[PDB]
Symmetry: C2
Subunit: 141 residues, 2 copies
């Protein structure tokens, strides 16, 4: 059943982000998979798997105990025709300048079998991203 497979693959993706190693975080993707941070005002460019893995190499060295979880009451929204899963998520991590806590709407798109990830839209709380960058800059001096 396609709906069940898409949900399994969406939970697997969540699991690989929580593994929080660069190899695990880019696992189970198609060759041409693209990760697209959003909203556009953040100015973060999309990433292929190699660009993403390189970014995670530094991310996983600067943050610890990353956790991604469904928001309370949130469920996977599944479009079987488009092989898409939408999830409302919360993140937590530990940084040099304290705690990181954010909120996201994520759109996952899978291949036609529903077994490999081929697109991610990661729509973050941009106010929090901006504030966190201010915190990092504050620690820089």
């Amino acid at each position: 059943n396609l709906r069940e497979q898409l949900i399994v693959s969406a939970h697997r993706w969540l699991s690989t982000m929580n593994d929080f190693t660069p190899d695990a975080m880019v696992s189970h993707r198609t060759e041409e998979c693209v990760t697209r941070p959003a909203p556009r005002s953040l100015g973060f460019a999309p990433l292929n798997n190699g660009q993403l893995r390189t970014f995670f190499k530094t991310l996983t060295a600067q943050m610890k105990n990353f956790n991604l979880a469904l928001m309370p009451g949130a469920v996977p929204i599944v479009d079987e025709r488009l092989r898409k899963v939408v999830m409302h998520l919360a993140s937590y991590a530990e940084a040099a300048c304290g705690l990181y806590e954010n909120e996201y709407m994520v759109v996952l798109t899978f291949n036609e079998e529903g077994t490999l990830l081929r697109d991610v839209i990661e729509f973050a709380d941009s106010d929090y991203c901006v504030k966190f960058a201010e915190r990092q800059a504050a620690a820089a001096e």
Copy 2:
């Protein structure tokens, strides 16, 4: 008629999602709260913006303010985005861009919206509006300065 067999809830949900967009672009308070169930709320997100949900009456009052302060409003799918439809849950997800003209200049926001419809797919029963919160905060600043 009744003895013909069927092979279209997805198409119905897409029609109602596009109707929601078109009535938003009509940009009158009445149009902007139309085709909703009696208990429907609009839920601003992320939580950091600090806004509680608005019921139909609260939302109409909000839009009376908004339609008095902005001109040439447009709400539309982001470039290249299409509606994402979960027939089982009666949900439609849309990545949207807004445009309007205010006293302080342009209003240009971006959202991920989750519409939930009633079982028949003909009335909106819930909206989550996940906004670009940095833009929201900056636009509040720009408005205060003016």
